PDB file of C-alpha atoms and ligand atoms in Angstrom:
ATOM      1  CA  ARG A 982     -21.752 -94.063   6.071  1.00  0.00           C
ATOM      2  CA  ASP A 983     -22.582 -93.262   9.713  1.00  0.00           C
ATOM      3  CA  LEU A 984     -20.331 -92.247  12.582  1.00  0.00           C
ATOM      4  CA  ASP A 985     -19.506 -94.469  15.543  1.00  0.00           C
ATOM      5  CA  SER A 986     -21.630 -93.408  18.543  1.00  0.00           C
ATOM      6  CA  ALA A 987     -18.393 -93.000  20.514  1.00  0.00           C
ATOM      7  CA  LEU A 988     -16.933 -90.496  18.017  1.00  0.00           C
ATOM      8  CA  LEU A 989     -20.225 -88.526  17.913  1.00  0.00           C
ATOM      9  CA  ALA A 990     -19.930 -88.286  21.705  1.00  0.00           C
ATOM     10  CA  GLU A 991     -16.192 -87.403  21.581  1.00  0.00           C
ATOM     11  CA  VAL A 992     -16.717 -84.501  19.146  1.00  0.00           C
ATOM     12  CA  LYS A 993     -20.159 -83.481  20.443  1.00  0.00           C
ATOM     13  CA  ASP A 994     -18.987 -79.972  21.373  1.00  0.00           C
ATOM     14  CA  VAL A 995     -18.370 -79.055  17.693  1.00  0.00           C
ATOM     15  CA  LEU A 996     -21.186 -80.947  15.922  1.00  0.00           C
ATOM     16  CA  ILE A 997     -24.360 -79.063  15.036  1.00  0.00           C
ATOM     17  CA  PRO A 998     -27.314 -81.377  14.168  1.00  0.00           C
ATOM     18  CA  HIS A 999     -28.443 -80.981  10.548  1.00  0.00           C
ATOM     19  CA  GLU A1000     -31.919 -80.037  11.822  1.00  0.00           C
ATOM     20  CA  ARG A1001     -30.496 -76.910  13.494  1.00  0.00           C
ATOM     21  CA  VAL A1002     -29.176 -75.646  10.135  1.00  0.00           C
ATOM     22  CA  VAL A1003     -30.471 -74.267   6.823  1.00  0.00           C
ATOM     23  CA  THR A1004     -28.138 -74.151   3.807  1.00  0.00           C
ATOM     24  CA  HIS A1005     -29.387 -71.771   1.100  1.00  0.00           C
ATOM     25  CA  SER A1006     -28.091 -73.968  -1.732  1.00  0.00           C
ATOM     26  CA  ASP A1007     -29.304 -71.315  -4.205  1.00  0.00           C
ATOM     27  CA  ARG A1008     -27.348 -68.502  -2.499  1.00  0.00           C
ATOM     28  CA  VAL A1009     -23.802 -69.435  -3.515  1.00  0.00           C
ATOM     29  CA  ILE A1010     -21.113 -67.015  -2.295  1.00  0.00           C
ATOM     30  CA  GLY A1011     -18.356 -68.753  -4.264  1.00  0.00           C
ATOM     31  CA  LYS A1012     -16.305 -71.909  -4.821  1.00  0.00           C
ATOM     32  CA  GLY A1013     -12.664 -72.469  -3.850  1.00  0.00           C
ATOM     33  CA  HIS A1014      -9.933 -75.109  -3.655  1.00  0.00           C
ATOM     34  CA  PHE A1015     -11.650 -77.085  -0.873  1.00  0.00           C
ATOM     35  CA  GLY A1016     -15.409 -76.533  -1.303  1.00  0.00           C
ATOM     36  CA  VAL A1017     -18.432 -74.324  -2.026  1.00  0.00           C
ATOM     37  CA  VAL A1018     -19.506 -71.524   0.313  1.00  0.00           C
ATOM     38  CA  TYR A1019     -23.208 -70.664   0.737  1.00  0.00           C
ATOM     39  CA  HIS A1020     -25.351 -68.271   2.722  1.00  0.00           C
ATOM     40  CA  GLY A1021     -27.115 -70.085   5.531  1.00  0.00           C
ATOM     41  CA  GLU A1022     -28.739 -69.954   8.947  1.00  0.00           C
ATOM     42  CA  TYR A1023     -28.530 -71.919  12.181  1.00  0.00           C
ATOM     43  CA  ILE A1024     -30.201 -71.927  15.583  1.00  0.00           C
ATOM     44  CA  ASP A1025     -27.925 -70.990  18.497  1.00  0.00           C
ATOM     45  CA  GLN A1026     -28.278 -72.293  22.063  1.00  0.00           C
ATOM     46  CA  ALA A1027     -30.589 -69.443  23.085  1.00  0.00           C
ATOM     47  CA  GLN A1028     -32.841 -70.645  20.212  1.00  0.00           C
ATOM     48  CA  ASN A1029     -32.170 -67.483  18.177  1.00  0.00           C
ATOM     49  CA  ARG A1030     -31.644 -67.848  14.430  1.00  0.00           C
ATOM     50  CA  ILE A1031     -28.244 -66.562  13.221  1.00  0.00           C
ATOM     51  CA  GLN A1032     -27.244 -65.863   9.612  1.00  0.00           C
ATOM     52  CA  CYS A1033     -23.844 -67.312   8.665  1.00  0.00           C
ATOM     53  CA  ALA A1034     -21.691 -68.702   5.863  1.00  0.00           C
ATOM     54  CA  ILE A1035     -21.567 -72.448   5.278  1.00  0.00           C
ATOM     55  CA  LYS A1036     -18.790 -74.247   3.410  1.00  0.00           C
ATOM     56  CA  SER A1037     -19.407 -77.809   2.231  1.00  0.00           C
ATOM     57  CA  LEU A1038     -16.020 -79.551   2.035  1.00  0.00           C
ATOM     58  CA  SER A1039     -15.442 -81.353  -1.273  1.00  0.00           C
ATOM     59  CA  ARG A1040     -12.191 -83.205  -0.463  1.00  0.00           C
ATOM     60  CA  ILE A1041     -13.186 -85.058   2.748  1.00  0.00           C
ATOM     61  CA  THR A1042     -14.886 -88.295   1.672  1.00  0.00           C
ATOM     62  CA  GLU A1043     -13.166 -91.344   3.190  1.00  0.00           C
ATOM     63  CA  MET A1044     -14.474 -92.069   6.687  1.00  0.00           C
ATOM     64  CA  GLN A1045     -10.975 -92.020   8.228  1.00  0.00           C
ATOM     65  CA  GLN A1046     -10.504 -88.505   6.835  1.00  0.00           C
ATOM     66  CA  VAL A1047     -13.961 -87.433   7.988  1.00  0.00           C
ATOM     67  CA  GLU A1048     -13.143 -88.607  11.509  1.00  0.00           C
ATOM     68  CA  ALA A1049      -9.740 -86.897  11.433  1.00  0.00           C
ATOM     69  CA  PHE A1050     -11.427 -83.681  10.327  1.00  0.00           C
ATOM     70  CA  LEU A1051     -13.994 -83.740  13.158  1.00  0.00           C
ATOM     71  CA  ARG A1052     -11.319 -84.236  15.819  1.00  0.00           C
ATOM     72  CA  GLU A1053      -9.377 -81.330  14.266  1.00  0.00           C
ATOM     73  CA  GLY A1054     -12.659 -79.370  14.185  1.00  0.00           C
ATOM     74  CA  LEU A1055     -12.972 -79.928  17.935  1.00  0.00           C
ATOM     75  CA  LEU A1056      -9.539 -78.360  18.422  1.00  0.00           C
ATOM     76  CA  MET A1057     -10.390 -75.406  16.186  1.00  0.00           C
ATOM     77  CA  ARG A1058     -13.687 -74.810  18.000  1.00  0.00           C
ATOM     78  CA  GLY A1059     -11.652 -73.676  21.018  1.00  0.00           C
ATOM     79  CA  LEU A1060      -9.631 -71.103  19.042  1.00  0.00           C
ATOM     80  CA  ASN A1061     -10.417 -67.537  20.099  1.00  0.00           C
ATOM     81  CA  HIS A1062      -8.639 -64.450  18.791  1.00  0.00           C
ATOM     82  CA  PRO A1063      -9.737 -61.090  17.299  1.00  0.00           C
ATOM     83  CA  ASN A1064      -7.709 -61.764  14.129  1.00  0.00           C
ATOM     84  CA  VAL A1065      -8.810 -65.382  13.660  1.00  0.00           C
ATOM     85  CA  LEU A1066     -12.133 -66.396  12.147  1.00  0.00           C
ATOM     86  CA  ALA A1067     -14.187 -68.448  14.641  1.00  0.00           C
ATOM     87  CA  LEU A1068     -15.470 -71.893  13.777  1.00  0.00           C
ATOM     88  CA  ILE A1069     -19.171 -71.954  14.747  1.00  0.00           C
ATOM     89  CA  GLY A1070     -19.288 -75.716  14.281  1.00  0.00           C
ATOM     90  CA  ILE A1071     -19.488 -78.599  11.812  1.00  0.00           C
ATOM     91  CA  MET A1072     -22.588 -80.197  10.329  1.00  0.00           C
ATOM     92  CA  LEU A1073     -23.010 -83.648   8.804  1.00  0.00           C
ATOM     93  CA  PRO A1074     -26.159 -84.034   6.643  1.00  0.00           C
ATOM     94  CA  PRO A1075     -27.387 -87.663   7.039  1.00  0.00           C
ATOM     95  CA  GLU A1076     -26.014 -88.642   3.633  1.00  0.00           C
ATOM     96  CA  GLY A1077     -23.366 -86.182   2.469  1.00  0.00           C
ATOM     97  CA  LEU A1078     -20.260 -84.211   3.274  1.00  0.00           C
ATOM     98  CA  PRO A1079     -18.986 -82.137   6.252  1.00  0.00           C
ATOM     99  CA  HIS A1080     -20.236 -78.544   6.332  1.00  0.00           C
ATOM    100  CA  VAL A1081     -18.331 -75.878   8.245  1.00  0.00           C
ATOM    101  CA  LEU A1082     -20.340 -73.016   9.769  1.00  0.00           C
ATOM    102  CA  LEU A1083     -18.533 -69.677   9.733  1.00  0.00           C
ATOM    103  CA  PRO A1084     -19.449 -66.128  10.836  1.00  0.00           C
ATOM    104  CA  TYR A1085     -20.558 -64.133   7.812  1.00  0.00           C
ATOM    105  CA  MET A1086     -17.924 -61.507   6.998  1.00  0.00           C
ATOM    106  CA  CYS A1087     -19.751 -58.608   5.359  1.00  0.00           C
ATOM    107  CA  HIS A1088     -16.717 -56.845   3.860  1.00  0.00           C
ATOM    108  CA  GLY A1089     -15.322 -59.867   1.945  1.00  0.00           C
ATOM    109  CA  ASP A1090     -11.592 -60.646   1.704  1.00  0.00           C
ATOM    110  CA  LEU A1091      -8.432 -58.499   1.825  1.00  0.00           C
ATOM    111  CA  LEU A1092      -7.522 -59.301  -1.765  1.00  0.00           C
ATOM    112  CA  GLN A1093     -10.772 -57.808  -3.120  1.00  0.00           C
ATOM    113  CA  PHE A1094     -10.611 -54.910  -0.661  1.00  0.00           C
ATOM    114  CA  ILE A1095      -7.182 -53.791  -1.861  1.00  0.00           C
ATOM    115  CA  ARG A1096      -8.093 -54.362  -5.546  1.00  0.00           C
ATOM    116  CA  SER A1097     -11.219 -52.163  -5.342  1.00  0.00           C
ATOM    117  CA  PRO A1098     -10.913 -49.180  -7.765  1.00  0.00           C
ATOM    118  CA  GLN A1099     -13.290 -47.389  -5.369  1.00  0.00           C
ATOM    119  CA  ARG A1100     -10.599 -47.223  -2.669  1.00  0.00           C
ATOM    120  CA  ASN A1101      -7.277 -45.412  -2.288  1.00  0.00           C
ATOM    121  CA  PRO A1102      -5.276 -47.411   0.330  1.00  0.00           C
ATOM    122  CA  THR A1103      -2.028 -45.916   1.603  1.00  0.00           C
ATOM    123  CA  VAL A1104       1.182 -47.800   2.321  1.00  0.00           C
ATOM    124  CA  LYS A1105       0.494 -47.336   6.043  1.00  0.00           C
ATOM    125  CA  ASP A1106      -3.045 -48.733   5.644  1.00  0.00           C
ATOM    126  CA  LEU A1107      -1.672 -51.794   3.869  1.00  0.00           C
ATOM    127  CA  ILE A1108       1.098 -52.541   6.385  1.00  0.00           C
ATOM    128  CA  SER A1109      -1.471 -52.140   9.184  1.00  0.00           C
ATOM    129  CA  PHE A1110      -3.599 -54.897   7.611  1.00  0.00           C
ATOM    130  CA  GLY A1111      -0.448 -57.034   7.383  1.00  0.00           C
ATOM    131  CA  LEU A1112       0.139 -56.562  11.121  1.00  0.00           C
ATOM    132  CA  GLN A1113      -3.379 -57.807  11.868  1.00  0.00           C
ATOM    133  CA  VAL A1114      -2.680 -60.939   9.776  1.00  0.00           C
ATOM    134  CA  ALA A1115       0.624 -61.450  11.653  1.00  0.00           C
ATOM    135  CA  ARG A1116      -1.244 -61.258  14.990  1.00  0.00           C
ATOM    136  CA  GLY A1117      -3.798 -63.887  13.918  1.00  0.00           C
ATOM    137  CA  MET A1118      -1.002 -66.130  12.650  1.00  0.00           C
ATOM    138  CA  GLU A1119       1.023 -65.727  15.864  1.00  0.00           C
ATOM    139  CA  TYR A1120      -1.983 -67.037  17.796  1.00  0.00           C
ATOM    140  CA  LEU A1121      -2.527 -69.996  15.435  1.00  0.00           C
ATOM    141  CA  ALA A1122       1.175 -70.902  15.641  1.00  0.00           C
ATOM    142  CA  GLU A1123       1.082 -70.742  19.457  1.00  0.00           C
ATOM    143  CA  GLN A1124      -1.968 -73.070  19.314  1.00  0.00           C
ATOM    144  CA  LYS A1125       0.030 -75.495  17.095  1.00  0.00           C
ATOM    145  CA  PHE A1126      -1.974 -74.862  13.938  1.00  0.00           C
ATOM    146  CA  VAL A1127      -0.361 -74.734  10.513  1.00  0.00           C
ATOM    147  CA  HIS A1128      -2.459 -72.823   7.986  1.00  0.00           C
ATOM    148  CA  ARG A1129      -1.122 -74.367   4.739  1.00  0.00           C
ATOM    149  CA  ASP A1130      -3.214 -71.992   2.586  1.00  0.00           C
ATOM    150  CA  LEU A1131      -2.414 -68.477   3.855  1.00  0.00           C
ATOM    151  CA  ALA A1132      -2.969 -65.771   1.235  1.00  0.00           C
ATOM    152  CA  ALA A1133      -4.698 -62.381   1.080  1.00  0.00           C
ATOM    153  CA  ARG A1134      -7.881 -64.008  -0.248  1.00  0.00           C
ATOM    154  CA  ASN A1135      -8.177 -66.000   3.015  1.00  0.00           C
ATOM    155  CA  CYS A1136      -8.030 -62.916   5.236  1.00  0.00           C
ATOM    156  CA  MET A1137     -11.632 -61.864   5.752  1.00  0.00           C
ATOM    157  CA  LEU A1138     -12.974 -58.461   6.802  1.00  0.00           C
ATOM    158  CA  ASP A1139     -15.779 -57.916   9.328  1.00  0.00           C
ATOM    159  CA  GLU A1140     -18.104 -54.927   9.796  1.00  0.00           C
ATOM    160  CA  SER A1141     -15.323 -52.914  11.460  1.00  0.00           C
ATOM    161  CA  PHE A1142     -12.641 -53.942   8.916  1.00  0.00           C
ATOM    162  CA  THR A1143     -10.982 -56.205  11.481  1.00  0.00           C
ATOM    163  CA  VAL A1144      -8.977 -58.853   9.609  1.00  0.00           C
ATOM    164  CA  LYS A1145      -9.914 -62.484  10.404  1.00  0.00           C
ATOM    165  CA  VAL A1146      -7.523 -65.199   9.218  1.00  0.00           C
ATOM    166  CA  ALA A1147      -9.656 -68.001   7.755  1.00  0.00           C
ATOM    167  CA  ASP A1148      -9.482 -71.341   5.919  1.00  0.00           C
ATOM    168  CA  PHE A1149      -6.846 -72.917   8.136  1.00  0.00           C
ATOM    169  CA  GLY A1150      -7.548 -76.514   9.176  1.00  0.00           C
ATOM    170  CA  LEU A1151      -8.611 -77.549   5.626  1.00  0.00           C
ATOM    171  CA  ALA A1152      -5.500 -78.411   3.588  1.00  0.00           C
ATOM    172  CA  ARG A1153      -3.475 -81.320   4.999  1.00  0.00           C
ATOM    173  CA  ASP A1154       0.045 -82.714   4.714  1.00  0.00           C
ATOM    174  CA  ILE A1155       0.410 -85.035   1.671  1.00  0.00           C
ATOM    175  CA  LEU A1156      -3.310 -85.731   0.999  1.00  0.00           C
ATOM    176  CA  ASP A1157      -3.911 -82.396  -0.785  1.00  0.00           C
ATOM    177  CA  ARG A1158      -0.705 -82.430  -2.905  1.00  0.00           C
ATOM    178  CA  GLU A1159      -2.821 -81.824  -6.035  1.00  0.00           C
ATOM    179  CA  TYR A1160      -3.316 -78.169  -5.035  1.00  0.00           C
ATOM    180  CA  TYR A1161       0.447 -77.662  -4.488  1.00  0.00           C
ATOM    181  CA  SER A1162       1.729 -79.535  -7.548  1.00  0.00           C
ATOM    182  CA  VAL A1163       3.686 -77.882 -10.377  1.00  0.00           C
ATOM    183  CA  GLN A1164       3.489 -80.804 -12.835  1.00  0.00           C
ATOM    184  CA  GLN A1165       0.393 -79.207 -14.410  1.00  0.00           C
ATOM    185  CA  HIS A1166       2.589 -76.228 -15.453  1.00  0.00           C
ATOM    186  CA  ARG A1167       0.141 -73.363 -16.118  1.00  0.00           C
ATOM    187  CA  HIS A1168      -2.680 -75.650 -14.932  1.00  0.00           C
ATOM    188  CA  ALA A1169      -1.204 -75.586 -11.393  1.00  0.00           C
ATOM    189  CA  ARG A1170      -3.415 -74.179  -8.625  1.00  0.00           C
ATOM    190  CA  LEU A1171      -2.988 -70.763  -6.986  1.00  0.00           C
ATOM    191  CA  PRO A1172      -1.414 -72.112  -3.729  1.00  0.00           C
ATOM    192  CA  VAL A1173       1.835 -73.184  -5.482  1.00  0.00           C
ATOM    193  CA  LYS A1174       3.001 -69.553  -5.608  1.00  0.00           C
ATOM    194  CA  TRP A1175       2.415 -68.957  -1.875  1.00  0.00           C
ATOM    195  CA  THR A1176       4.076 -72.207  -0.805  1.00  0.00           C
ATOM    196  CA  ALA A1177       7.519 -72.523   0.798  1.00  0.00           C
ATOM    197  CA  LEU A1178      10.183 -74.111  -1.374  1.00  0.00           C
ATOM    198  CA  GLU A1179      10.597 -77.137   0.954  1.00  0.00           C
ATOM    199  CA  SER A1180       6.827 -77.796   1.055  1.00  0.00           C
ATOM    200  CA  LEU A1181       6.617 -77.726  -2.762  1.00  0.00           C
ATOM    201  CA  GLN A1182       9.132 -80.585  -2.505  1.00  0.00           C
ATOM    202  CA  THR A1183       7.568 -82.695   0.318  1.00  0.00           C
ATOM    203  CA  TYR A1184       3.908 -81.597   0.872  1.00  0.00           C
ATOM    204  CA  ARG A1185       4.817 -81.243   4.558  1.00  0.00           C
ATOM    205  CA  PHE A1186       3.903 -77.878   6.068  1.00  0.00           C
ATOM    206  CA  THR A1187       5.122 -76.127   9.239  1.00  0.00           C
ATOM    207  CA  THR A1188       4.685 -72.708  10.853  1.00  0.00           C
ATOM    208  CA  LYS A1189       7.899 -71.779   9.031  1.00  0.00           C
ATOM    209  CA  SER A1190       6.269 -72.619   5.693  1.00  0.00           C
ATOM    210  CA  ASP A1191       3.367 -70.392   6.805  1.00  0.00           C
ATOM    211  CA  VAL A1192       5.978 -67.667   7.451  1.00  0.00           C
ATOM    212  CA  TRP A1193       7.036 -67.962   3.819  1.00  0.00           C
ATOM    213  CA  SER A1194       3.361 -67.675   2.794  1.00  0.00           C
ATOM    214  CA  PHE A1195       3.016 -64.551   4.959  1.00  0.00           C
ATOM    215  CA  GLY A1196       5.906 -62.915   3.080  1.00  0.00           C
ATOM    216  CA  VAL A1197       4.055 -63.430  -0.208  1.00  0.00           C
ATOM    217  CA  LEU A1198       0.945 -62.070   1.492  1.00  0.00           C
ATOM    218  CA  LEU A1199       2.804 -58.869   2.446  1.00  0.00           C
ATOM    219  CA  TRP A1200       3.906 -58.591  -1.186  1.00  0.00           C
ATOM    220  CA  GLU A1201       0.258 -58.867  -2.296  1.00  0.00           C
ATOM    221  CA  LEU A1202      -0.728 -56.063   0.075  1.00  0.00           C
ATOM    222  CA  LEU A1203       1.937 -53.645  -1.137  1.00  0.00           C
ATOM    223  CA  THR A1204       1.291 -54.328  -4.847  1.00  0.00           C
ATOM    224  CA  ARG A1205      -2.482 -54.154  -4.112  1.00  0.00           C
ATOM    225  CA  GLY A1206      -3.107 -57.639  -5.401  1.00  0.00           C
ATOM    226  CA  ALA A1207      -0.606 -58.330  -8.161  1.00  0.00           C
ATOM    227  CA  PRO A1208      -0.332 -62.031  -9.089  1.00  0.00           C
ATOM    228  CA  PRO A1209       3.002 -63.374  -7.696  1.00  0.00           C
ATOM    229  CA  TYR A1210       5.567 -64.591 -10.263  1.00  0.00           C
ATOM    230  CA  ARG A1211       3.153 -63.629 -13.072  1.00  0.00           C
ATOM    231  CA  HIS A1212       5.470 -64.529 -15.978  1.00  0.00           C
ATOM    232  CA  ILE A1213       7.041 -67.708 -14.531  1.00  0.00           C
ATOM    233  CA  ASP A1214       5.723 -71.141 -15.529  1.00  0.00           C
ATOM    234  CA  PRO A1215       5.143 -72.993 -12.172  1.00  0.00           C
ATOM    235  CA  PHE A1216       7.228 -75.808 -13.671  1.00  0.00           C
ATOM    236  CA  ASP A1217      10.225 -73.425 -13.457  1.00  0.00           C
ATOM    237  CA  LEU A1218       9.217 -72.009 -10.075  1.00  0.00           C
ATOM    238  CA  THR A1219      11.239 -74.395  -7.860  1.00  0.00           C
ATOM    239  CA  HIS A1220      14.315 -73.715 -10.024  1.00  0.00           C
ATOM    240  CA  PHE A1221      13.795 -69.935  -9.845  1.00  0.00           C
ATOM    241  CA  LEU A1222      13.567 -70.077  -6.035  1.00  0.00           C
ATOM    242  CA  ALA A1223      16.500 -72.493  -5.780  1.00  0.00           C
ATOM    243  CA  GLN A1224      18.661 -69.973  -7.684  1.00  0.00           C
ATOM    244  CA  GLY A1225      17.677 -67.561  -4.861  1.00  0.00           C
ATOM    245  CA  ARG A1226      15.458 -65.309  -6.980  1.00  0.00           C
ATOM    246  CA  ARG A1227      12.456 -63.880  -5.135  1.00  0.00           C
ATOM    247  CA  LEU A1228       9.551 -61.515  -5.648  1.00  0.00           C
ATOM    248  CA  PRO A1229      10.871 -57.968  -6.345  1.00  0.00           C
ATOM    249  CA  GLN A1230      10.410 -55.050  -3.965  1.00  0.00           C
ATOM    250  CA  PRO A1231       7.091 -53.244  -4.739  1.00  0.00           C
ATOM    251  CA  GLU A1232       7.453 -49.631  -5.855  1.00  0.00           C
ATOM    252  CA  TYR A1233       6.350 -48.049  -2.562  1.00  0.00           C
ATOM    253  CA  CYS A1234       7.360 -50.828  -0.182  1.00  0.00           C
ATOM    254  CA  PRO A1235       9.800 -49.479   2.470  1.00  0.00           C
ATOM    255  CA  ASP A1236      13.211 -51.164   2.579  1.00  0.00           C
ATOM    256  CA  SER A1237      12.511 -52.262   6.145  1.00  0.00           C
ATOM    257  CA  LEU A1238       9.458 -54.283   5.072  1.00  0.00           C
ATOM    258  CA  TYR A1239      11.155 -55.727   1.944  1.00  0.00           C
ATOM    259  CA  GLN A1240      13.851 -56.968   4.330  1.00  0.00           C
ATOM    260  CA  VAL A1241      11.179 -58.741   6.419  1.00  0.00           C
ATOM    261  CA  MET A1242       9.771 -60.292   3.232  1.00  0.00           C
ATOM    262  CA  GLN A1243      13.266 -61.527   2.395  1.00  0.00           C
ATOM    263  CA  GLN A1244      13.657 -63.056   5.879  1.00  0.00           C
ATOM    264  CA  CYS A1245      10.288 -64.812   5.375  1.00  0.00           C
ATOM    265  CA  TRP A1246      11.647 -66.374   2.161  1.00  0.00           C
ATOM    266  CA  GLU A1247      15.012 -67.620   3.471  1.00  0.00           C
ATOM    267  CA  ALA A1248      15.657 -71.065   1.977  1.00  0.00           C
ATOM    268  CA  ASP A1249      16.460 -72.430   5.444  1.00  0.00           C
ATOM    269  CA  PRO A1250      13.178 -72.613   7.430  1.00  0.00           C
ATOM    270  CA  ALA A1251      15.152 -72.365  10.683  1.00  0.00           C
ATOM    271  CA  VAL A1252      16.480 -68.961   9.621  1.00  0.00           C
ATOM    272  CA  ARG A1253      13.014 -67.507   8.924  1.00  0.00           C
ATOM    273  CA  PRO A1254      11.554 -65.557  11.893  1.00  0.00           C
ATOM    274  CA  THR A1255       8.634 -66.695  14.053  1.00  0.00           C
ATOM    275  CA  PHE A1256       5.270 -64.964  13.835  1.00  0.00           C
ATOM    276  CA  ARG A1257       5.962 -63.585  17.330  1.00  0.00           C
ATOM    277  CA  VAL A1258       9.054 -61.802  16.013  1.00  0.00           C
ATOM    278  CA  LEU A1259       7.253 -60.663  12.842  1.00  0.00           C
ATOM    279  CA  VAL A1260       4.494 -59.066  14.923  1.00  0.00           C
ATOM    280  CA  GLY A1261       7.149 -57.060  16.763  1.00  0.00           C
ATOM    281  CA  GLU A1262       9.085 -56.147  13.615  1.00  0.00           C
ATOM    282  CA  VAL A1263       6.034 -55.063  11.636  1.00  0.00           C
ATOM    283  CA  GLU A1264       4.718 -53.038  14.593  1.00  0.00           C
ATOM    284  CA  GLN A1265       8.084 -51.246  14.750  1.00  0.00           C
ATOM    285  CA  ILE A1266       8.007 -50.493  11.012  1.00  0.00           C
ATOM    286  CA  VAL A1267       4.477 -49.092  11.258  1.00  0.00           C
ATOM    287  CA  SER A1268       5.406 -46.758  14.127  1.00  0.00           C
ATOM    288  CA  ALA A1269       8.612 -45.600  12.385  1.00  0.00           C
ATOM    289  CA  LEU A1270       7.043 -44.728   8.984  1.00  0.00           C
ATOM    290  CA  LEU A1271       7.940 -41.293   7.558  1.00  0.00           C
ATOM    291  CA  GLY A1272       5.272 -39.752   5.318  1.00  0.00           C
ATOM    292  CA  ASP A1273       2.701 -41.852   3.463  1.00  0.00           C
ATOM    293  CA  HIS A1274       2.019 -42.600  -0.202  1.00  0.00           C
ATOM    294  CA  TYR A1275      -1.094 -43.760  -1.996  1.00  0.00           C
ATOM    295  CA  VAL A1276      -0.491 -47.048  -3.805  1.00  0.00           C
ATOM    296  CA  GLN A1277      -1.716 -47.653  -7.377  1.00  0.00           C
ATOM    297  CA  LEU A1278      -3.418 -50.780  -8.688  1.00  0.00           C
ATOM    298  CA  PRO A1279      -1.214 -53.187 -10.775  1.00  0.00           C
TER     299      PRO A1279
HETATM  300  N1  LIG B2673     -17.215 -66.456   6.305  1.00  0.00           N
HETATM  301  C1  LIG B2673     -17.367 -65.939   5.089  1.00  0.00           C
HETATM  302  N2  LIG B2673     -18.173 -64.862   4.924  1.00  0.00           N
HETATM  303  C2  LIG B2673     -18.321 -64.355   3.693  1.00  0.00           C
HETATM  304  N3  LIG B2673     -17.771 -64.756   2.548  1.00  0.00           N
HETATM  305  C3  LIG B2673     -16.988 -65.829   2.749  1.00  0.00           C
HETATM  306  C4  LIG B2673     -16.733 -66.457   3.948  1.00  0.00           C
HETATM  307  N4  LIG B2673     -15.868 -67.528   3.766  1.00  0.00           N
HETATM  308  C5  LIG B2673     -15.615 -67.522   2.479  1.00  0.00           C
HETATM  309  N5  LIG B2673     -16.271 -66.515   1.810  1.00  0.00           N
HETATM  310  C6  LIG B2673     -16.198 -66.220   0.385  1.00  0.00           C
HETATM  311  O1  LIG B2673     -16.691 -67.334  -0.320  1.00  0.00           O
HETATM  312  C7  LIG B2673     -15.987 -67.465  -1.589  1.00  0.00           C
HETATM  313  C8  LIG B2673     -15.426 -68.858  -1.692  1.00  0.00           C
HETATM  314  O2  LIG B2673     -14.511 -69.052  -0.589  1.00  0.00           O
HETATM  315  P1  LIG B2673     -13.341 -70.140  -0.649  1.00  0.00           P
HETATM  316  O3  LIG B2673     -13.891 -71.465  -1.067  1.00  0.00           O
HETATM  317  O4  LIG B2673     -12.597 -70.082   0.651  1.00  0.00           O
HETATM  318  O5  LIG B2673     -12.424 -69.584  -1.847  1.00  0.00           O
HETATM  319  P2  LIG B2673     -11.090 -68.684  -1.902  1.00  0.00           P
HETATM  320  O6  LIG B2673     -11.021 -67.977  -0.567  1.00  0.00           O
HETATM  321  O7  LIG B2673     -11.281 -67.853  -3.127  1.00  0.00           O
HETATM  322  N6  LIG B2673      -9.909 -69.805  -2.071  1.00  0.00           N
HETATM  323  P3  LIG B2673      -9.351 -70.906  -0.958  1.00  0.00           P
HETATM  324  O8  LIG B2673      -9.882 -70.543   0.405  1.00  0.00           O
HETATM  325  O9  LIG B2673      -7.803 -70.861  -1.035  1.00  0.00           O
HETATM  326  O10 LIG B2673      -9.786 -72.321  -1.298  1.00  0.00           O
HETATM  327  C9  LIG B2673     -14.937 -66.346  -1.606  1.00  0.00           C
HETATM  328  O11 LIG B2673     -15.390 -65.195  -2.311  1.00  0.00           O
HETATM  329  C10 LIG B2673     -14.771 -66.016  -0.124  1.00  0.00           C
HETATM  330  O12 LIG B2673     -14.307 -64.700   0.074  1.00  0.00           O
HETATM  331 MG1  LIG B2674     -10.959 -69.044   1.128  1.00  0.00          MG
END
């Protein structure tokens, strides 16, 4: 189960040798759809030791998929934006699965931030976070990356509460259909309810299906973390959306933003706006707000 020397050379700029990395397998941060995240440490190029997070991927086993992942890793390694979480690199233990090294984000994820009873976010605070997500997504789209798993939980917060979009480059067209399937009814996975109607049908994802996901993300923000479509069996979800029903306008969501959400969820992907346009629209909404309300927990 070893890589071709040629591959190893091709993807050298993203591989970190296992002997430059410690995974604290007893310091588990949490487990998700696509692997387990641990505290860890690696040695940089200056020979300094850096604390980080390390995610061992559970769904990448076949060698063709491992190779595909590393080549995609090499692309991601070159991504650089304030609102996008850096990929430090990838590590292959001699026998075992690909590990992704990520900057440790000390303030956790947006979903937990907004759900914290110890905080009192305003509407304007919440839309401002949304704008930061839009900016990260605009950059990813420009770089020809489709997230496939965009949601408030995958927007991380650093020491200065800068939002970093994370966990792109993991889910794939077709291969990961299990996480997007509705045939398990109330055993279906979280991503179903963030996924564009057409992608529920085909397991093919585009930037326009990410735009749909972003609409649901905005709805999360302005409900401070309500579960989308709480009372709908996922089995009925495609039918609900095909009738043209959508998430309802949150109590303190301005009409201008609800309109953007509605654009994001147009049934025709071509009609949905680009992230570039969303950035502009959301920026305009922020600047044109009148007054400000606290927002309650759901
Ligand atoms: N770079 C990071 N720094 C700190 N915590 C992180 C980092 N990446 C992930 N986590 C946390 O690790 C836990 C597991 O992450 P993950 O496996 O991505 O699950 P998820 O975000 O809940 N779902 P998903 O990403 O859709 O599969 C979550 O509490 C994350 O917030
Ligand atoms: Mg995640």
